[PDB]
Structure 1
Amino acid sequence: RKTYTLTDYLKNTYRLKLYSLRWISDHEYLYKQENNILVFNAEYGNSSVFLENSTFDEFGHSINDYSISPDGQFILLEYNYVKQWRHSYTASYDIYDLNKRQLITEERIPNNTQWVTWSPVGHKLAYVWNNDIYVKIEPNLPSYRITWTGKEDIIYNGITDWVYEEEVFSAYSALWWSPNGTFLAYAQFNDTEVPLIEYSFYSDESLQYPKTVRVPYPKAGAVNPTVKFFVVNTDSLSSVTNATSIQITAPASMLIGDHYLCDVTWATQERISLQWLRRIQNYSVMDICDYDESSGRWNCLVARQHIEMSTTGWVGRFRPSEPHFTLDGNSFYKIISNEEGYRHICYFQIDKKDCTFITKGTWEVIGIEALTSDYLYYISNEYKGMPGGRNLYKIQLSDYTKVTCLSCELNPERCQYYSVSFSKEAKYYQLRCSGPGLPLYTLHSSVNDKGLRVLEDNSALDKMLQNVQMPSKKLDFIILNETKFWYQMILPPHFDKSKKYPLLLDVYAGPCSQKADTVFRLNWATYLASTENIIVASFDGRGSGYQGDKIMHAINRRLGTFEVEDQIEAARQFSKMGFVDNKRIAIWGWSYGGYVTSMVLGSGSGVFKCGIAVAPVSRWEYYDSVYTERYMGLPTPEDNLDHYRNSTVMSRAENFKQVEYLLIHGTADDNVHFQQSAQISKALVDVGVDFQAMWYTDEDHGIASSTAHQHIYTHMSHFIKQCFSLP
């Protein structure tokens, strides 16, 4: 008789259990038993206590994370965790000897270390501190400082700056050990002329003057960071002479203009692959660099370059694909568009231009997961032609026809969204099942692909959910101009298709987005349907991903058009399904969704009663360069300034008179700047439109403070309930 209330979502009353493990060897992994770390065996499921809780009672500090050295002799300890941006943070580090069972108290890793990583084998150590790189050959010995040029907010050695972190690497780190730990490949970023975004930080009430944050941040068309790439030989590091770092220069075609280092991948011990991208993100080059013994330098033969380019839009889904090399390093696999525009696996041969495709069809390969000498293991959405499903497939390297599905039939009813975790030589794999049923976690041996045991089945959650009226989940498609376009609906408990429901359209709709999937979730929508009887829906229209280029490249150079209209058209289709009170239709989104939400409410379609935009982009000139220019080119008279000018929400301010509007922005948002919503709010005030604002002091782009998270969703629920006349 009870429903999924707001407080159930805001308090995690029903918690989804994960099974988070990490492979140590090829048959041994680790797990956290609330307080204990064990070494589980991949053969038997027997575990012995690897690390007890009372091991670091005496430490004094709270331990954020840990890290085992590859040989299993040392453990790196992380504490005083201070977050920066999406991936970046700062921590104090301690090394603990596992065999001697004691803290290394000499030559300790400094406070405020930006990044640390063990070498792939043994126990070498590379850390970045004040933007410079240091290498430790032994945990208790001095560290050789490899770089000297590192300067705050200007020169980044072995770590990324803002825009590379967010948009290019999805990591703070910019270091790459060679396979056996001999070479340390690193990148360097010059931000000298990159402009600063500035904003207040009001901080604790005890701070009398607001602080001002200043981040090097290239908005669309402004001066970008510049990048150099280096490889240093750690084995011949000297106490007496500074370590010499060999530079691999960008190729001819990339130097002629602004460019990006967008991918670094080691092939073998003496082989490394670089992928450069042009600022105009439709032309990329892949250099393959070998080590010359006599020279001591790296040489990339021109005849080994490979061009990944695209006539119909940007290259890659968000960045070009990474390569997966055979062991001998004379051959690799990656995911490119085929001639009909669908992303599949091409078998490349080191020395030739033409590659041959190993998979094909009207569906896309999502990722390459591991390759052995016998098999290539990949995930795709081929199963039942469902773009929103994920399944694991193995392909035989001796016969491209022999392709087995390893996950499709395991549990076809409860399980359709899979992800994988292979052991250190791909002997075993963990399968995470994400929906539509409750998450399921299993372990298998890839020799015969048979199941071994259930790691987590969420039966503890299952039992509790029977006591609650849960909403149901409809994934389906519709036909627009002869193409399938998928949508999902979170349908209220005891759903009655003859009754008339209020509908909340939940929008993201960015380039290569996908809001219609088979993933079980417990979010606000769950509550909205369950307690408030509102049908929340999502619809992947033009420019959404995993369906080929034709659909994804549709919005090329035309952001804020087709995908906006497609959202309006989606609601129009939903109200023509006849179970929708077309007088009470609302739209809401975050980030890009925030934007679409605003462009739709400002469209004048008349379809939408009200809507909420959280942290919206308002015009593209205000957003970071790499993301924007990827889809928009440059805001110049010679490029695309016209459609930059022509696609802002400020320009649509008049039509907002027709709707009710809640705009929310975190004041300390470094990603989508407060500036964006401030420029919207102004435009509306100017043309006399009334709306609702909520700023969030010192909240950033996630508004994910413990307390702000609660408050923002409470605030929105009140807004939505009232706009739908629900008491």
Structure 2
Amino acid sequence: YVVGLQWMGDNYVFIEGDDLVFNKTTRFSAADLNALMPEFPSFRTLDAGRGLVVLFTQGGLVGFDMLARKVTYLFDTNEETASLDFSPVGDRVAYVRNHNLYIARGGKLGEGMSRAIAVTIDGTETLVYGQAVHQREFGIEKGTFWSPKGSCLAFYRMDQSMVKPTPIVDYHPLEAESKPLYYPMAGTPSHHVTVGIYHLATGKTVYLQTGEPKEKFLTNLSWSPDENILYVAEVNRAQNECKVNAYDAETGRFVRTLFVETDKHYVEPLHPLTFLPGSNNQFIWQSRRDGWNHLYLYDTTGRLIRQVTKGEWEVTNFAGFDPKGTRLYFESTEASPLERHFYCIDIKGGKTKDLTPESGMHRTQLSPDGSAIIDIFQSPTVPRKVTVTNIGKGSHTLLEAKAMPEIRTGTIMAADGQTPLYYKLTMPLHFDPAKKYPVIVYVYGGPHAQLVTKTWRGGWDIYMAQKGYAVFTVDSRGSANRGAAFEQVIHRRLGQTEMADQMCGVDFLKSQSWVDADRIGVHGWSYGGFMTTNLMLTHGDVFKVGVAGGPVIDWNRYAIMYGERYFDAPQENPEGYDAANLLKRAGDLKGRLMLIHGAIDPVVVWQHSLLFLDACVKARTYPDYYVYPSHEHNVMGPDRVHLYETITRYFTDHL
């Protein structure tokens, strides 16, 4: 590891416990910095180009210019840190505190402080401001969006007063305390999001006139460079139409629909418009419309200039432009879906140039000037290789790293007999081919994830293998980075294809002489917990033992914005929902299955596993259980040791 490796101006920078080291060598010490403070530490980089960061300290935030080596501003956000969103000007920060949105202005060293401005005053339990909405679907990670010159702050306003909440119970007080979680379930009334724009110069707020239906999803907010227009990708409840619309930032009025995308199954916008350098009129839009995620060049009237990238592979990260905006830089699966390389392509399209040719996983940062890249590489044979490259040519290696369980990899055919699936197999520690071994299928299988890549490597497979158990994983159809067709086969039919493909994995395991076919188990979390449970109920003669963590059990109880994409609405798809409703098949549990839930899980509500145990009571079947009362969806931190030991012992006891 090379702590905090990143660009600052035209220098690449990393920490050495005490120093921050710059190269294009200069060195900046924690004591040098400490001397400059008002009253090597951790920081958040605000502006890589300018090397502007913020330092989290006792009594407030200190902005710091690492290139000038000078304090910029002190910020007082009343101890709020989670929702911090600094203006691109660097001298103001937005945050949410006790339900409301505020802007705090930075104070110059010893020039006194100003009281923060309240953008909103009526925030409440059912009226949420400046936070993520739509259950963080559609790439939404926050609810504040500064205009690029800092003149305005756009923000979400989510009225969830029509959403029927779920109790989230804190068991630690003397008497347990419940708080409502406004988690909108499939087929129910959604929340109503609108977008406000607060104009800093006048203190006026205008709301975008997004109109009806009020449930429409307002995603990928993207400001025009000149701050006159705020663009929004609006998605309908069916999730088969996305309209990219322009709104006037001064009045909130609708201006025009630039373009509309539609899909047989679903459209899923995940990334904002990105304007070309120096341009207010041209932008890149990511779209999976042709079956593969690609980069499209548009003007602001909505006219498509050209598809810039194309091929039966997907762009997985858009990194930006050359200064002239004549080239695009991005990460993609072009080399292989099991790999990630960094590429250059002419804005006019045509041939990609792979800038990180070595076979495996590259994670790459383009410098602020667009002239160089930091590259961090790993492969099954290479633990870590850190390169810095002046784009054509001159690569400089900065770092290279050099009984454990054997990992085997390969391909099997999916249940269609045509589609190749990639698998990884962690062999028992000290594996002996003369011996028979139990094996656990570790499954996820849900959209957006891909578990099998050409990496060096959260190590539960290795722990299990150390206890003498092989662990097998296969990326079944439904999984990611293989194009839309490979994913969308699951539409309206969750579990069906996924399980058919996982059984192809089992066919492969049973073809291995060293596999004890009577000692096959299964483990997964979330979609993986749904899959674990579904496989035990559906293939109960095969799967002897399973452990299902935070499992989805009834998709009618999953959040609207995720579940209705892949499954449609419960009213539109009773047959598909019914087939995946594991409560209806609890009587088919004939093996040993432990369900595990964090009690305060806001992703898969606790009710899922509790109702399964309830269904098993009625059906006279006999699962086991563990609850982590202090944890949300996943068990995080040191308690993860307890989790691994609980899961592992369940398998060593019963499988």
- Note whether the superposition's TM-score is higher than 0.5: yes
- Matched residues in 2 for 1:705 and 1:633: separation? 36
Checking the alignment, whether the CA contact within 8 Å between 1:69 and 1:76 is kept in structure 2 is: no
The amino acid that maps onto 1:405 is D
Deviation larger for 140-149 or 532-541:
140-149
How far apart are the structure 2 equivalents of 1:64 and 1:681?
45
The answer to whether 1:391 aligns with 2:369 is no
Relative to 1, partners in 2 of residues 1:256 and 1:46: Cα closer, same or farther, differing over 3 Å?
A: same
Question: Residue 262 of structure 1: SS of its match in structure 2?
Answer: strand
2:317 pairs with 1:335: no
Write out per-residue CA displacement over residues 464-497 of structure 1, whole angstroms, 9 at most, x where no aligned residue.
xxxx334224243435421212212122356555
Distance 1:362 1:160, change over 3 A: closer
Query: Aligned residue for 2:84?
Result: 116
Match for residue 689 of structure 1 among 589, 596, 621: 621
Aligned to 1:714: 645
Q: Is the 8 A contact 1:70 1:120 kept in 2?
A: no
**What is the RMSD of the two structures over their aligned residues, measured on CA atoms?**
3.1
**Change beyond 3 A, Cα 1:520–1:629:** same
State the match for 2:320 in structure 1. 370
Contact 2:49 2:368 in 1 (8 A): no
Gap change, CA 1:587 and 1:314, over 3 Å in 2: same
Instruction: Show the 5 A alignment for 1:258-273.
Output: 258-270=215-227, 271-273=229-231
Partner in structure 1 of residue 56 of structure 2: 78
Find out whether 1:478 has 2:413 as its counterpart.
yes
Which of 521, 524, 528 aligns to 1:589? It is 524
In 2 relative to 1, CA 97–689 (structure 1 residues): closer, same or farther, beyond 3 Å?
Answer: closer
Matching residue's letter, 2:56: E
Match of 1:542 in 2: 477
Q: Which amino acid aligns with 2:282?
A: S
Matched, 1:246 2:177: no
The 1:469–1:138 alpha-carbon spacing in structure 2 relative to 1, beyond 3 Å, is: closer
Deviations 1:368-414 (A, max 9, x none): 1112223101111121xx3221111111224x3332111123xx3xx
Would the alpha carbon gap of residues 298 and 429 (structure 1) be closer, same or farther in structure 2, given more than 3 Å must change? farther
Q: SS of 2:651's equivalent?
A: helix
Does structure 2 retain, via aligned residues, the 8 Å contact 1:508–1:592?
Answer: yes
How far residue 536 of structure 1 moved from its aligned partner, in angstroms, is 0.9
Q: Distance in 1 between matches of 2:71 and 2:484?
A: 56
Within 2, Cα distance between the matches of 1:287 and 1:30? 40
Matched, 1:233 2:199: yes
Residue by residue, what CA displacement relative to the aligned partner does 1:633-666 show, whole Å, maximum 9, x if unpaired? 2222xx1234323321111112212x12111112
Give the Cα–Cα distance (whole angstroms) in 2 for the partners of residues 65 and 272 of structure 1. 31
Q: Find out whether 1:46 has 2:16 as its counterpart.
A: no
Percent of aligned pairs with the same residue?
A: 22
Q: 1:356 to 1:69 in 2, by over 3 A?
A: closer
2:449 — aligned with what?
513
Is the 8 Å Cα contact of residues 71 and 123 (structure 1) preserved in structure 2?
A: no
Question: Matched residue of 1:258: which SS?
Answer: coil
1:108-157: CA deviation from partner (whole Å, max 9, x where unpaired): 33234652232223423333323333334442442462523442322222
What residue is the counterpart of 1:7 in the other structure?
none
Please list the CA deviations of residues 544-569 of structure 1 after superposition, one character each: whole Å capped at 9, or x if unmatched. 22212221110111112211232223
1:309 has 2:262 as partner: yes
Where do 5+ consecutive residues of structure 1 fail to align? Answer: 1-16, 81-91, 238-242, 463-467
C-alpha separation between the residues in 2 aligned to 1:18 and 1:596? 38
Q: How far apart in 2 are the matches of 1:100 and 1:588?
A: 51
Q: 1:532 to 1:348 in 2, by over 3 A?
A: same
2:374 aligned residue (430, 447, 462): 430
Does 1:185 find its partner at 2:117? no
Of 118, 128, 144, which residue of structure 1 is paired with 2:96?
Answer: 128
Do residues 198 (structure 1) and 167 (structure 2) align?
yes
1:87 counterpart residue number:
none
Q: CA deviation at 1:441?
A: 4.5
Aligned counterparts, 1:363-512, within 5 A: 363-372=313-322, 373-383=325-335, 386-398=336-348, 400-409=349-358, 412=359, 416-454=360-398, 456-457=399-400, 459=401, 462=402, 468-478=403-413, 480-493=416-429, 495=431, 499-512=435-448
2:561 aligns with: 626
Q: 1:37 to 1:300 in 2, by over 3 A?
A: farther
Q: Distance in 2 between matches of 1:256 and 1:186?
A: 20
Query: Given the alignment of the two structures, is residue 570 of structure 1 paired with residue 570 of structure 2, yes or no?
Result: no
**Deviation digits for residues 649-691 of structure 1 (CA, Å, limit 9, x no counterpart):** 111112212x121111122222211111101111112222122
Residue 20 of structure 1 aligns with an amino acid whose one-letter code is: G
1:19–1:441 contact (8 Å) kept in structure 2: no
TM-score normalised by length of structure 1? 0.81
Residue identity in the other structure for 1:650: L
Q: CA deviation at 1:325?
A: 2.1
* Deviation for aligned residue 1:217: 1.6
Q: CA deviation at 1:448?
A: 1.9
The one-letter code sitting in structure 1 at the alignment partner of 2:22 is F
Question: 1:661 is matched with which residue?
Answer: 593
Alpha-carbon distance in structure 2 between the residues aligned to 1:378 and 1:75: 25
TM-score, normalising length from structure 2? 0.90
Equivalent residue, structure 2, for 1:4:
none
Aligned to 1:157: 129
Contact 2:193 2:214 in 1 (8 A): no
Give the match for residue 222 of structure 1.
188
Secondary structure of 2:298's aligned partner: strand
User: What displacement does 1:576 show?
Assistant: 2.1
Q: How many residues align?
A: 644
2:585 to 626, 629, 652: 652
Contact map agreement 1:134 1:143 (CA 8 A) in 2: no
The structure-2 alpha-carbon separation of the partners of 1:598 and 1:244, relative to structure 1 and needing over 3 Å to count, comes to same
Query: Residue type matched to 2:155 in 1?
Result: Y
The question of whether the paired residues in 2 share the 8 Å contact of 1:492 and 1:533 is answered with yes
Q: CA deviation at 1:71?
A: 9.2
User: Could you tell which deviates more after superposition, 616-625 or 63-72?
Assistant: 63-72
CA–CA separation in structure 2 for the residues paired with 1:608 and 1:521: 26
CA contact (8 A) 1:70 1:122 kept: no
Q: In the alignment, is the contact (CA less than 8 A) between 2:191 and 2:215 conserved in 1? A: no
1:283 to 241, 251, 275: 241
Change beyond 3 A, Cα 1:174–1:617: same
Compare relative contact order (CA 8 Å, sep 6+) and give the higher one, 1 or 2.
Answer: 1
